[PDB]
Design an enzyme around this catalytic site. Structure first.
Site, PDB file in Angstrom:
ATOM      1  N   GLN B  11       0.826  -1.204   0.000  1.00  0.00           N
ATOM      2  CA  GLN B  11       0.000   0.000   0.000  1.00  0.00           C
ATOM      3  C   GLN B  11       0.861   1.255   0.000  1.00  0.00           C
ATOM      4  O   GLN B  11       0.561   2.228  -0.704  1.00  0.00           O
ATOM      5  CB  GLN B  11      -0.935  -0.009   1.209  1.00  0.00           C
ATOM      6  CG  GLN B  11      -1.842   1.202   1.306  1.00  0.00           C
ATOM      7  CD  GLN B  11      -2.936   1.019   2.335  1.00  0.00           C
ATOM      8  OE1 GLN B  11      -3.849   1.838   2.438  1.00  0.00           O
ATOM      9  NE2 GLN B  11      -2.849  -0.056   3.106  1.00  0.00           N
ATOM     10  N   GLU B  71      -3.536  -7.397  -0.840  1.00  0.00           N
ATOM     11  CA  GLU B  71      -4.944  -7.112  -0.588  1.00  0.00           C
ATOM     12  C   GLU B  71      -5.525  -6.310  -1.750  1.00  0.00           C
ATOM     13  O   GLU B  71      -4.874  -5.389  -2.253  1.00  0.00           O
ATOM     14  CB  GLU B  71      -5.143  -6.394   0.755  1.00  0.00           C
ATOM     15  CG  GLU B  71      -4.711  -4.938   0.855  1.00  0.00           C
ATOM     16  CD  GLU B  71      -3.445  -4.760   1.673  1.00  0.00           C
ATOM     17  OE1 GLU B  71      -2.537  -5.610   1.554  1.00  0.00           O
ATOM     18  OE2 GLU B  71      -3.354  -3.772   2.433  1.00  0.00           O
ATOM     19  N   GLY B 144       4.329  -6.824   6.416  1.00  0.00           N
ATOM     20  CA  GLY B 144       3.492  -7.571   5.490  1.00  0.00           C
ATOM     21  C   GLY B 144       4.097  -7.657   4.110  1.00  0.00           C
ATOM     22  O   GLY B 144       5.191  -8.195   3.929  1.00  0.00           O
ATOM     23  N   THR B 145       3.362  -7.135   3.122  1.00  0.00           N
ATOM     24  CA  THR B 145       3.765  -7.253   1.724  1.00  0.00           C
ATOM     25  C   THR B 145       5.046  -6.481   1.437  1.00  0.00           C
ATOM     26  O   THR B 145       5.914  -6.962   0.701  1.00  0.00           O
ATOM     27  CB  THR B 145       2.646  -6.753   0.816  1.00  0.00           C
ATOM     28  OG1 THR B 145       2.499  -5.343   0.993  1.00  0.00           O
ATOM     29  CG2 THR B 145       1.340  -7.415   1.176  1.00  0.00           C
ATOM     30  N   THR B 179       2.936   3.192  13.203  1.00  0.00           N
ATOM     31  CA  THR B 179       1.552   2.759  13.053  1.00  0.00           C
ATOM     32  C   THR B 179       1.331   1.355  13.608  1.00  0.00           C
ATOM     33  O   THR B 179       0.532   1.167  14.527  1.00  0.00           O
ATOM     34  CB  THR B 179       1.137   2.816  11.579  1.00  0.00           C
ATOM     35  OG1 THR B 179       1.859   1.822  10.845  1.00  0.00           O
ATOM     36  CG2 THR B 179       1.436   4.186  10.996  1.00  0.00           C
ATOM     37  N   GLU B 254      25.919   6.361 -12.174  1.00  0.00           N
ATOM     38  CA  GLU B 254      26.563   7.427 -11.416  1.00  0.00           C
ATOM     39  C   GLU B 254      26.151   7.365  -9.953  1.00  0.00           C
ATOM     40  O   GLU B 254      26.987   7.531  -9.057  1.00  0.00           O
ATOM     41  CB  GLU B 254      26.186   8.793 -11.990  1.00  0.00           C
ATOM     42  CG  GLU B 254      26.493   9.048 -13.455  1.00  0.00           C
ATOM     43  CD  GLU B 254      27.946   8.925 -13.811  1.00  0.00           C
ATOM     44  OE1 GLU B 254      28.399   7.786 -14.024  1.00  0.00           O
ATOM     45  OE2 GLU B 254      28.627   9.968 -13.901  1.00  0.00           O
TER      46      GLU B 254
HETATM   47  N1  LIG Z   1       4.670   7.887   3.060  1.00  0.00           N
HETATM   48  C1  LIG Z   1       3.689   6.992   3.131  1.00  0.00           C
HETATM   49  N2  LIG Z   1       3.823   5.891   3.950  1.00  0.00           N
HETATM   50  C2  LIG Z   1       2.830   4.973   4.028  1.00  0.00           C
HETATM   51  C3  LIG Z   1       1.672   5.133   3.287  1.00  0.00           C
HETATM   52  N3  LIG Z   1       0.860   4.089   3.551  1.00  0.00           N
HETATM   53  C4  LIG Z   1       1.476   3.275   4.436  1.00  0.00           C
HETATM   54  N4  LIG Z   1       2.694   3.815   4.748  1.00  0.00           N
HETATM   55  C5  LIG Z   1       3.688   3.238   5.668  1.00  0.00           C
HETATM   56  O1  LIG Z   1       3.516   1.836   5.713  1.00  0.00           O
HETATM   57  C6  LIG Z   1       3.579   1.357   7.039  1.00  0.00           C
HETATM   58  C7  LIG Z   1       2.602   0.203   7.226  1.00  0.00           C
HETATM   59  O2  LIG Z   1       2.932  -0.874   6.380  1.00  0.00           O
HETATM   60  P1  LIG Z   1       2.275  -1.019   4.918  1.00  0.00           P
HETATM   61  O3  LIG Z   1       3.217  -0.531   3.846  1.00  0.00           O
HETATM   62  O4  LIG Z   1       0.968  -0.268   4.874  1.00  0.00           O
HETATM   63  O5  LIG Z   1       1.991  -2.595   4.774  1.00  0.00           O
HETATM   64  P2  LIG Z   1       1.695  -3.222   3.326  1.00  0.00           P
HETATM   65  O6  LIG Z   1       2.889  -3.043   2.422  1.00  0.00           O
HETATM   66  O7  LIG Z   1       0.464  -2.590   2.728  1.00  0.00           O
HETATM   67  O8  LIG Z   1       1.446  -4.788   3.596  1.00  0.00           O
HETATM   68  P3  LIG Z   1       0.294  -5.293   4.598  1.00  0.00           P
HETATM   69  O9  LIG Z   1       0.872  -5.531   5.971  1.00  0.00           O
HETATM   70  O10 LIG Z   1      -0.271  -6.587   4.073  1.00  0.00           O
HETATM   71  O11 LIG Z   1      -0.794  -4.250   4.686  1.00  0.00           O
HETATM   72  C8  LIG Z   1       3.222   2.531   7.928  1.00  0.00           C
HETATM   73  O12 LIG Z   1       4.060   2.556   9.058  1.00  0.00           O
HETATM   74  C9  LIG Z   1       3.454   3.759   7.075  1.00  0.00           C
HETATM   75  O13 LIG Z   1       4.587   4.455   7.533  1.00  0.00           O
HETATM   76  C10 LIG Z   1       1.530   6.237   2.461  1.00  0.00           C
HETATM   77  O14 LIG Z   1       0.505   6.383   1.801  1.00  0.00           O
HETATM   78  N5  LIG Z   1       2.544   7.168   2.383  1.00  0.00           N
HETATM   79 MG   LIG Z   2      -1.280  -4.320   2.675  1.00  0.00          MG
END
Ligand SMILES: Nc1nc2c(ncn2[C@@H]2O[C@H](COP(=O)(O)OP(=O)(O)OP(=O)(O)O)[C@@H](O)[C@H]2O)c(=O)[nH]1
Ligand SMILES: [Mg+2]
Ligand SMILES: Nc1nc2c(ncn2[C@@H]2O[C@H](COP(=O)(O)OP(=O)(O)OP(=O)(O)O)[C@@H](O)[C@H]2O)c(=O)[nH]1
Ligand SMILES: Nc1nc2c(ncn2[C@@H]2O[C@H](COP(=O)(O)OP(=O)(O)O)[C@@H](O)[C@H]2O)c(=O)[nH]1
Ligand SMILES: [Mg+2]
Lengths: 50, 437, 44, 150, 11, 431, 437
Positions: B11, B71, B144-145, B179, B254
């Site tokens: 995400q 997801e 997660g992912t 988070t 570079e």
């Molecule tokens: N800068 C930024 N960071 C994000 C954003 N969404 C999620 N994050 C970061 O992602 C962390 C949570 O892990 P996710 O990347 O959401 O997990 P995932 O890759 O979706 O995999 P899952 O665990 O299955 O949901 C949080 O601590 C946020 O710092 C976003 O839209 N912008």
């Molecule tokens: Mg996810």
């Protein structure tokens, strides 16, 4: 021109959602306001019947 | 010609891609539906869009991007939103279940069932492209992912594509304000498998983005929209040397050979720092000396980390706009004669600069102002060891009492692999100390 | 000297307003609380 | 009214007195008291001659939604923190100023220059033009610091 | 003052 | 972004502060519902000093209604501008008053001060600055002198650095309405001395004399007195809410008035105060405003100035006027009445000027003075207390409800030493 | 390249800065929105604005000022007034809690919470400034921010900047007219600590400006707007030799070494002439001799005290308009041959003449008449010993029984500072009498 198109789409989406939650909040208030009279009419009818 | 494939994982990668491909399309003139606007732009010919887009003959440009999320709830936003008629449908790959903030679930159970499809799509994009510059993997260590499937991709892709430079933009968790709760576990697990395969891993930290856009941009209520917009500005300033013609062109090779001294110190900090609101920008000169002095400030690093308590390995300045290399040299001379900015003894020449004539593009509904000069500062710094030590502390006082371990064990991880991951990051600490002494 | 005069006329207009509201309050023939026995006698 | 009904001592609305476009006013009609059917006795306080057509006296001020801020102090605070100054100035949203700190800059009319509006304020400026080497040193000394030409 | 002048002219 | 937390308590405090909210709401441009209907930004810059914004454009005030019996709350709600207070700071008991300071301080009053402090803590750390507190009460009742003093003690303990003032409707021998008023006043001044930052003590009989005199008010009732007190409140606090030529907040007034820590008992006064038959027979100018300020007829705390000597005297003007005229009038008053001023303090008039006048007046002014004649009321209340406590007056209520006579003796001594402290500077020479 | 930074501290400082920047914008042509209209008029490359106005290149000029006050009620009126889009929004520094009329409050606890940000803004503005002529610091001696925070700011500036021309403009308390009550306390406290840090300590007295405006302006009810307009004309006449070319120019470096004899006696008195109205300007000759005789007059001194009971150590004369030097020399010879104006014995030459061609620019709605000739006279006389004597006579009378001392000693200032300041200003008086004898 490409920036103005995207700005137009965002403005339209924002207006359409703003009117939407305004309707939801005001309809909720209207239903609660009508229920307020419904309760007191129920009480008056109960007292008269008893 | 000089093209680069963008893989977005998780995400936190998909939302960055949504804020990034918008900026790419607006910079190169392609409409949200993949077309040139009403065939009025076409008066000549150019290969500026060829880096991140490819013609399909008639009028259509598809992007060299692969969106992956296990997801199916943020990919469908792309598949039903404004940028529906831009991406190829087979690029926007999604799964059925969720990794559920579990590295083992994203690397052993669900990651083993869609990896073949995403690698086939990467193979199709590589056969489509002519000469590859590399990959940009947009993800978060997170959970997660972004920890499991990204590491699985960078294993099964680095075994398949040879050297083939593999820049990795990683959202790094905050020192305190995070988070999820198994984020230390996921970071320690993903840094063990994203160390021998990554070539340059740009760190970005959410606390630092919040503080920078709270102080400089005067936004008291920021969000992921502004965060991913700033990251999009970073990746635009990085790839503008590939896309557009400039005085000095600084591409991916570079980046590696000027930012990676030793083949384990490849974790730089990206600070895009003429950041300013539209009200304060009209009352400032925004000249070269000011924008260079803004980057070498502890209150503008886009990872929450003070560079004063540390030493610089090497630095990469990327200027965009009506900028001259001689004011650049004057700025670098003032920085080097300054005492607060401390370098290492073994790197006397520690600057690489790239001048580009393209002004920074402005996104409507944004908060950054239309500036005539931009600088992106990529620093390899000893100070990131404090963030690594903080994640080691967080991992240690959870693995002391085996909290949140039965999940990984049931998903398929062996018990000791946490200990090898901790030993690997401890060796990374010893490497940073030995190169910083 | 024009603005001080506009202030003077606003004072005189509020004097007329107070007199009109006073006459309406000398009218309004219910006198405030108006106990329901007297109220229904006046109503019927 | 207001303060003890002393009336002829100033404005009842000291800020609304000097405003170019004040708020719209509502000429309300009160629901009196008694129902639709009742005899009314002429009390021996009014007169058999008609009452005042009380139209300019039954007044109440309803809010207006200007696009600057929607009558909300919280939005006023993030506008102040974002440093977005208001569009219309104090010479435009007011008449001649209320506070005395607005007197510096009350002669400024946006549509007409001062010299054209009144010609008696024209002062011919005596300025020496900067020469070529002075311009060179001035434009260079801003950008660079370790360079000096005599 | 218009309305009272009407009854003034009336009587 | 300064703010004031209002903490009206008792029947007298609730009525006066309700009138105060009615006076300040239409001054800030707020309807009885609570919606902002003002036109300019001079209204809606300093709303947060006295109000909190709610969703929907409503502006709730920042008051904590305190009582110990229902009925005053019902009168507040039934009155105009009543449906604007939030119905959660309506803290009130269910047993009642009785003009018993023990009932207001130690017993069943004190099982409600926890709820009052909880409301004040919510409403205090709901915001950013928390400049200070106002409390309005009467020093003649159980819920005004018990609840008021308990609140002042607890909040001075909790936040011992803010500005925190009381308004203190004092008793009087004529116009008394209660026999245990000397007991309550003498036993509550003890708490007001070491726990308040400033008290603007107000005399009911002086307000009645204002109504009989120059206001020329035939049937005053209990609303016009609260209107006068509200006008003094707005004149005091207008420098926080509106810009001025010379601004002076509550801490500035506290610094420039009280010279020694146990001397913060000031005398409110307001000008102009004319009659309806004389509204158009005298122009409203700065010297006439100053004369009506320094007149004793407009003094609403008794204490005729000629039987005493002024310490620091502050005047807060409202309206468009000239600092030259204001300062030369302040000079001329001091030069003319050199006898009725402290010789070891020169230039002892604190002048503040705000540009925005109140509603209905082109200009106005607020007097406060640290006059020596404030010892007169404390002397007469101590006289009544020592006439009562001598042959064991109404005391079985207090003792069986839970106090010792040592508290009464301590209160009498700690009032008499304050009387002596004010008496000290009535004839003290410079050199 | 000559250019100055103006620091307006306190309510009096901010309001004087408002009425001063209005005059600067009017006489330099910059409109309140910051844009020079130009319109291809008789201007042929004007550069006089770059002593006070910075130039970001859009046609917009921003001034070199910081408006600091530890209370928002006047900075907010600046932000919402006519000159809203003129100053840099980060140079409208304001505090949360109002510092009362209390030197300890303005100096010790809440004074040391905003001083770092003020110093950072001044550091950035002076980094922008190429060749720094000096700082013009505007405040009052009434107390709070103008006495405590101003003294703290000068204490920091004298440490981190060095030997820079720190000209100061003070609103000195009147002998009998006063607003606050602890004004003697605040003035005694601030003189002791601005004695060793301010190069020049220009005085203005409100009672004297009141009597001037009531006597020769024919203004029966003057106000702070008129007072600050007159102070604005004084400071513009002082600083206009940096901006407009003249027959003989004097700047902030020659300025002090001609005015101040001894390192403690640095308290000049600035008076302006003519301060006549248009009604009486219609019937006069307004020659240089007339204006100089009006300058050297006891009823025209602005720090009110009779200078006939004093000795003139130095006089800085500033002529503006169509002023020829022969009339200057004739007027100076005439007032030297006059027996009343007697100079101190170690001073046969005691005038510093500065001629400038630019006449005063009338402000519409003002009180001063448009004149083609003006003289600003700058005395350094021994008549200020009387003002110091009145200030001590108030201060020891107040302090003889510890009035208002509890506020300072509970705020944090010790008891000994009052005695130290009293002995320091008594040393100043004995220096004045030993230099006048
Ligand atoms: N800068 C930024 N960071 C994000 C954003 N969404 C999620 N994050 C970061 O992602 C962390 C949570 O892990 P996710 O990347 O959401 O997990 P995932 O890759 O979706 O995999 P899952 O665990 O299955 O949901 C949080 O601590 C946020 O710092 C976003 O839209 N912008
Ligand atoms: Mg996810
Ligand atoms: N000439 C002039 N003097 C002023 C003006 N405003 C205030 N003063 C003087 O300032 C004195 C009051 O103290 P202030 O200067 O306002 O206090 P401050 O320095 O602003 O610090 P604070 O106490 O926090 O307000 C008065 O005695 C005035 O003489 C002004 O606009 N013009
Ligand atoms: N000025 C004024 N005085 C009041 C008001 N209400 C009560 N009082 C005075 O307060 C005294 C009685 O105190 P009370 O208010 O009953 O104290 P409580 O029982 O604690 O509320 C009487 O002598 C009244 O003169 C009011 O609205 N205004
Ligand atoms: Mg102030």
């Amino acid at each position: 021109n490409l920036s103005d198109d995207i700005a137009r789409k965002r403005a339209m989406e924002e207006e359409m959602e703003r009117v939407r939650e305004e309707l939801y909040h005001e309809e909720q208030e209207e239903t609660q306001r009508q229920k307020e009279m419904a309760e007191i009419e129920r009480q008056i009818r109960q007292r008269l019947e008893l | 010609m000089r093209e680069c494939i963008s893989i977005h994982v998780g995400q936190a990668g998909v939302q960055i891609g949504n804020a990034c491909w918008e900026l790419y399309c607006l910079e190169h003139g392609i409409q949200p539906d993949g077309q040139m606007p009403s065939d009025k732009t076409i008066g000549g010919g150019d290969d500026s869009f060829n880096t991140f887009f490819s013609e399909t003959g008639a009028g259509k440009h598809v992007p060299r991007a692969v969106f992956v999320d296990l997801e199916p709830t943020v990919v469908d936003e792309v598949r039903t939103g404004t940028y529906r008629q831009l991406f190829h449908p087979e690029q926007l790959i999604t799964g059925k279940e969720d990794a559920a903030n579990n590295y083992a679930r994203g690397h052993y159970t669900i990651g083993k069932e869609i990896v073949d499809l995403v690698l086939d799509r990467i193979r199709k994009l590589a056969d489509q492209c002519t000469g590859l510059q590399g990959f940009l993997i947009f993800h978060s260590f997170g959970g997660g992912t972004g920890s499991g499937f990204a590491s699985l991709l960078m294993e099964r892709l680095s075994v398949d594509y040879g050297k083939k430079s593999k820049l990795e933009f990683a959202i790094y968790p905050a020192p305190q304000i995070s988070t999820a709760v198994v984020e230390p576990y996921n970071t320690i697990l993903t840094t063990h498998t994203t160390l021998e395969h990554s070539d340059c891993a740009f760190m970005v930290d959410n606390e630092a983005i919040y503080d920078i856009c709270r102080r400089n941009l005067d936004i008291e209520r920021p969000t992921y929209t502004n965060l991913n917009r700033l990251i999009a500005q970073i990746v635009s300033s990085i790839t503008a040397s590939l896309r557009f013609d400039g005085a000095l062109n600084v591409d991916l090779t570079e980046f590696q050979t000027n930012l990676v001294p030793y083949p384990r110190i490849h974790f730089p900090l990206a600070t895009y720092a003429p950041v300013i609101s539209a009200e304060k920008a009209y009352h400032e000169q925004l000249s070269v000396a000011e924008i260079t002095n803004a980057c070498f400030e502890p209150a503008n690093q886009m990872v929450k980390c003070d560079p004063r308590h540390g030493k610089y390995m090497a630095c990469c300045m990327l200027y965009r706009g009506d900028v001259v290399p001689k004011d650049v040299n004057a700025a670098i001379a003032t920085i080097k004669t300054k005492r607060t900015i401390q370098f290492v003894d073994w790197c006397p020449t520690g600057f690489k600069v790239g001048i580009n004539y393209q002004p920074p593009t402005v996104v409507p509904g944004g908060d950054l102002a239309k500036v005539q000069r931009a600088v992106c500062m990529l620093s390899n710094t000893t100070a990131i060891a404090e963030a690594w030590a903080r994640l080691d502390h967080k991992f240690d006082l959870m693995y002391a009492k085996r909290a949140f371990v039965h999940w990984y064990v049931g998903e398929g991880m062996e018990e000791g692999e946490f200990s090898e991951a901790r030993e690997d990051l401890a060796a990374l600490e010893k490497d940073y100390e030995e190169v910083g002494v | 000297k024009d603005e001080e005069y506009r202030e003077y006329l606003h004072g005189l207009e509020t004097e007329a307003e107070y007199q009109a509201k006073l006459k309406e309050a000398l009218a309004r023939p219910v006198i405030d609380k108006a106990h329901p026995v007297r109220r229904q006698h006046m109503s019927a | 009214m207001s303060f003890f009904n002393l009336t002829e001592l100033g404005y009842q609305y000291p800020i609304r007195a000097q405003v170019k476009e004040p708020n719209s006013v509502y000429s309300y009609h009160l629901a009196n008291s008694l129902p639709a059917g009742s005899y009314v006795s002429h009390r021996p306080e009014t007169a058999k001659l008609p009452p005042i057509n009380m139209h300019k006296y039954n007044k109440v001020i309803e809010p207006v939604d200007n696009p600057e801020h929607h009558g909300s102090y919280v939005k006023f605070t993030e506008r102040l923190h974002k440093h977005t100054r208001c569009a219309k100035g104090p010479n435009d949203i007011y008449r001649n100023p209320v506070t005395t700190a607005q007197l510096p800059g009350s002669w400024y009319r946006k549509e007409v220059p001062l010299k054209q509006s009144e010609p008696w304020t024209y002062v011919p400026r005596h300025v020496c033009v900067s020469s070529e080497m002075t311009k060179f040193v001035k434009e260079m000394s801003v950008t660079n610091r370790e360079f000096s030409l005599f | 003052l218009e309305t009272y002048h009407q009854q003034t002219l009336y009587r | 972004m300064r703010e004031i937390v209002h903490m009206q308590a008792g029947q007298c405090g609730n009525q006066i502060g309700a009138k105060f909210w009615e006076v300040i709401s239409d001054e800030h441009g707020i309807d009885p519902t609570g919606t902002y209907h003002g036109d300019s930004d001079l209204q809606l810059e300093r709303i947060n000093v006295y109000y909190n914004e709610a969703t929907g454009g409503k502006y709730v005030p920042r008051a904590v209604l305190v009582d110990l019996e229902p009925g005053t709350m019902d009168s507040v709600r039934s009155g105009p501008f009543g449906q604007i207070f939030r119905p959660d700071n309506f803290v009130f008991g269910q047993s009642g008053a009785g003009n018993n300071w023990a009932k207001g301080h130690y017993t069943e009053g004190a099982e409600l001060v926890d709820s009052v402090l909880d409301v004040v803590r919510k409403e205090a750390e709901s915001c950013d600055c928390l400049q200070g507190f106002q409390l309005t009460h009467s020093l003649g009742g159980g819920t005004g002198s018990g609840m008021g003093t308990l609140l002042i003690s607890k909040i001075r303990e909790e936040y011992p650095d803010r500005i925190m003032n009381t308004f203190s409707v004092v008793p009087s021998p004529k116009v008394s309405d209660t026999v245990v008023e000397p007991y309550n006043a003498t036993l509550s001044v003890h708490q007001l001395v070491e726990n308040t930052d400033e008290t603007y003590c107000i005399d009911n009989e002086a307000l009645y004399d204002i109504c009989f005199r120059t206001l020329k008010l035939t049937t005053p009732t209990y609303g016009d007195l609260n209107h006068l007190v509200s006008a003094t409140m707005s004149g005091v606090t207008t420098c926080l809410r509106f810009p001025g030529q010379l601004n002076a907040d509550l801490r500035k007034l506290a610094v420039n008035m009280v010279p020694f820590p146990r001397l913060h008992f000031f005398m409110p006064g307001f000008a102009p105060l004319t009659s309806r038959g004389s509204q158009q027979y005298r122009a409203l100018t700065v010297p006439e405003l100053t004369q009506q300020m320094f007149d004793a007829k407009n003094m609403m705390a008794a204490c005729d100035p000629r039987h005493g000597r002024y310490l620091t005297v502050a005047a807060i003007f409202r309206g468009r006027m000239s600092m030259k005229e204001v300062d030369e009038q302040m000079l001329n008053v001091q030069n003319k009445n050199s006898s009725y001023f402290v010789e070891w303090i020169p230039n002892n008039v604190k002048t503040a000027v705000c540009d925005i006048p109140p509603r209905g007046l082109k200009m106005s002014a607020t007097f406060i003075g640290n006059s020596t004649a404030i010892q007169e009321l404390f002397k007469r209340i101590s006289e009544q207390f020592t006439a009562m406590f001598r042959r064991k007056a109404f005391l079985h209520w207090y003792t069986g409800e839970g106090m010792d006579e040592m508290e009464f003796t301590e209160a009498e001594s700690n009032m008499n030493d304050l009387v002596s402290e004010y008496q000290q500077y009535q004839d003290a020479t410079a050199e």
